[PDB]
């Protein structure tokens, strides 16, 4: 599980998730798993999907996780009233918008990249698509 | 462990550009010298900029550091 | 002024001959000679630094400037602005007189003298060496020493490269093993 | 840099005199000349200028660039400035110590009638 090594403040406000994404082209690799839905992704979903990919295209290839969590999500325990402070940091999510290339892959044929990205897009909560490295 | 904040100090620009002032009028109550004193403007002890002559407030950008002066045009 | 005159004829002429300079002023000249004695054991004793100051007062012909600590560091148990060394900046006539005594009579009185290292340039021609005894200067009375106190010399010159400082210093014959 | 160090020494009194709005007598000392010029309160335009590079001053001097030369220049700026209706200036020493021949120049300008 991914999590920043050392923050600056422990608890972040909710804020909103509007507009489109910045990481949009397949930059590092050759094939990409790009988001279409909005959503947000916990570190467990990123790890689950990465294990599905790494298993699927065996220890050949090279995989880039282009998103990183760095946003702490706090929850209140059970049978605790409202108020009395902000909750506790339970997990860490990345906020996703439509357009984020969530993962990249290189060093495989395209048909294995289709296969691993299908296998791993079923571990994520957002609708997802397959993209290739377009040249300009 | 939290739950405290100071009282709001009501800083900022009190007279804007082109706004006619009397002598003595505070123009920008502020905290450092975010705005510097120009012609006919004095800077108080807490970096309050006040009209030293009558006229009109003139916000400008001068000098090699692009500082934000405040002059007063005699009027 | 003996080595200053010797400079003004034969070292200026000699270095204009060796290196193919155009300007007569492009030649290296020695700017200053700083004598530091960074005592450090004066964290507990003041008379020890006073005796150090008397020794640099004897070796050069000037009062030294007792230097203070720039930062506080705890590795050596010091504090900000605590006096920890003393130095003399010799320049002008006294630079040449001290340089004459140094290369003439002080350097040969070094114990087990093999020569001064030629790789003790800081890249910009400026020599710096260290003596381990203050006894090697003929002024320091051997019967009046209490602590052995070396010091470090630094010849600062106007040469750009360090081979150019090899040339400048070596034209005073300045031993160079 | 020696020149840049001098200018940052000058700057406080320069900006203060531009803030008050007084006609300033800017001096300028060089190892063989002294220069003196009276500058309007807008700072752009000069009024009076004398110096040792002028042959009207330089011919009657032994050496341009000592205290006698500077006293001659101060006398000249005071004379020309009184001829052009300027009476009360403020002395801009322009980064030099008020000690040597800038003191000689300014004392000589005060003897010959220029009010500061």
């Amino acid at each position: 599980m991914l999590q920043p090594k050392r923050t600056k403040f422990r608890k972040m406000h909710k804020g909103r998730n509007r507009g489109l994404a910045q990481g949009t082209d397949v930059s590092f690799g050759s094939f990409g798993l790009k988001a279409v839905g909005r959503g947000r992704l916990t570190a467990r979903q990123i790890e689950a999907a990465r294990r599905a990919m790494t298993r699927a295209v065996k220890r050949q290839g090279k995989i880039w996780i282009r998103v990183f969590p760095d946003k702490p999500i706090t929850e209140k325990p059970l049978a605790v009233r409202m108020g009395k402070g902000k909750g506790n940091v339970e997990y860490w999510v990345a906020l996703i918008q439509p357009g984020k290339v969530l993962y990249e892959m290189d060093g495989v044929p395209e048909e294995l990249a289709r296969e691993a990205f299908k296998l791993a897009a079923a571990k994520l909560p957002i609708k997802t698509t397959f993209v290739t490295k377009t040249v300009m | 462990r939290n739950g405290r904040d100071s009282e709001a100090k009501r800083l900022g620009v009190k007279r804007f550009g082109g706004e006619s002032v009397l002598a003595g009028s505070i123009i920008v109550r502020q905290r450092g010298t975010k705005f510097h004193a120009g012609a006919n403007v004095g800077c108080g002890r807490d970096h309050t900029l006040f009209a030293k002559a009558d006229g009109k407030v003139k916000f400008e950008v001068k000098g090699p550091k692009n500082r934000k002066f405040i002059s007063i045009e005699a009027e | 002024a003996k080595l200053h005159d010797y400079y003004k004829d034969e070292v200026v002429k000699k270095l204009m001959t060796e290196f193919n300079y155009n300007s007569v002023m492009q030649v290296p000249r020695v700017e200053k000679i700083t004598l530091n004695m960074g005592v450090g054991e004066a964290i507990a004793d003041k008379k020890l630094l006073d005796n150090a100051a008397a020794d640099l007062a004897a070796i050069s012909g000037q009062k030294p400037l007792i230097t203070k600590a720039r930062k506080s560091v705890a590795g050596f148990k010091i504090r900000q602005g605590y006096p920890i060394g003393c130095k003399v900046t010799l320049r002008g006539e006294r630079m040449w007189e001290f340089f004459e005594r140094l290369i003439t009579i002080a350097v040969p009185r070094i114990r087990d003298f093999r020569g001064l290292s030629a790789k003790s340039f800081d890249g910009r021609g400026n020599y710096s060496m260290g003596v381990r005894e203050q006894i090697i200067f003929p002024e320091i009375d051997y019967d009046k020493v209490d602590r052995v106190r070396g010091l470090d010399i630094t010849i600062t010159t106007t040469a750009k490269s360090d081979e150019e400082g090899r040339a400048l210093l070596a034209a005073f014959d300045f031993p160079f093993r | 840099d020696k020149k840049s160090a001098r200018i940052r020494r000058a700057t406080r009194a320069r900006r203060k005199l531009q803030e008050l709005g007084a006609t300033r007598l800017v001096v300028h000392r060089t190892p063989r000349h002294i220069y003196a010029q009276v500058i309007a309160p807008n700072g752009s335009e000069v009024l009076v200028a004398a110096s040792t590079v002028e042959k009207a001053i330089a011919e009657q001097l032994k050496y341009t660039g000592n205290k006698d030369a500077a006293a001659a220049v101060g006398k000249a700026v005071a004379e020309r400035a009184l001829e052009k209706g300027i009476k009360d200036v403020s002395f801009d020493r322009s980064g030099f110590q008020y000690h040597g021949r800038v003191q000689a120049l300014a004392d000589a300008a005060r003897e010959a009638g220029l009010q500061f």
Partner: protein
């Protein structure tokens, strides 16, 4: 230099066993007897006897 805070730095005459009579300024305040000078010190013979071992 300033006034009298500095030690008295008067010209003396050093003389070693090499016959090198040499007058210099030094604040000893006394004439000087030496053995080794820059002229006739075993520096080059010293380097030779250093290398000449094996």
């Amino acid at each position: 230099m300033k006034k009298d805070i500095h030690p008295k730095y008067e010209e003396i005459t050093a003389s070693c066993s090499c016959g090198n009579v040499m007058k210099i300024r030094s604040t000893v305040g006394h004439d000087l007897n030496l053995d080794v000078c820059s002229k006739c010190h075993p520096f080059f013979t010293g380097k030779q006897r250093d290398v000449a071992t094996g």
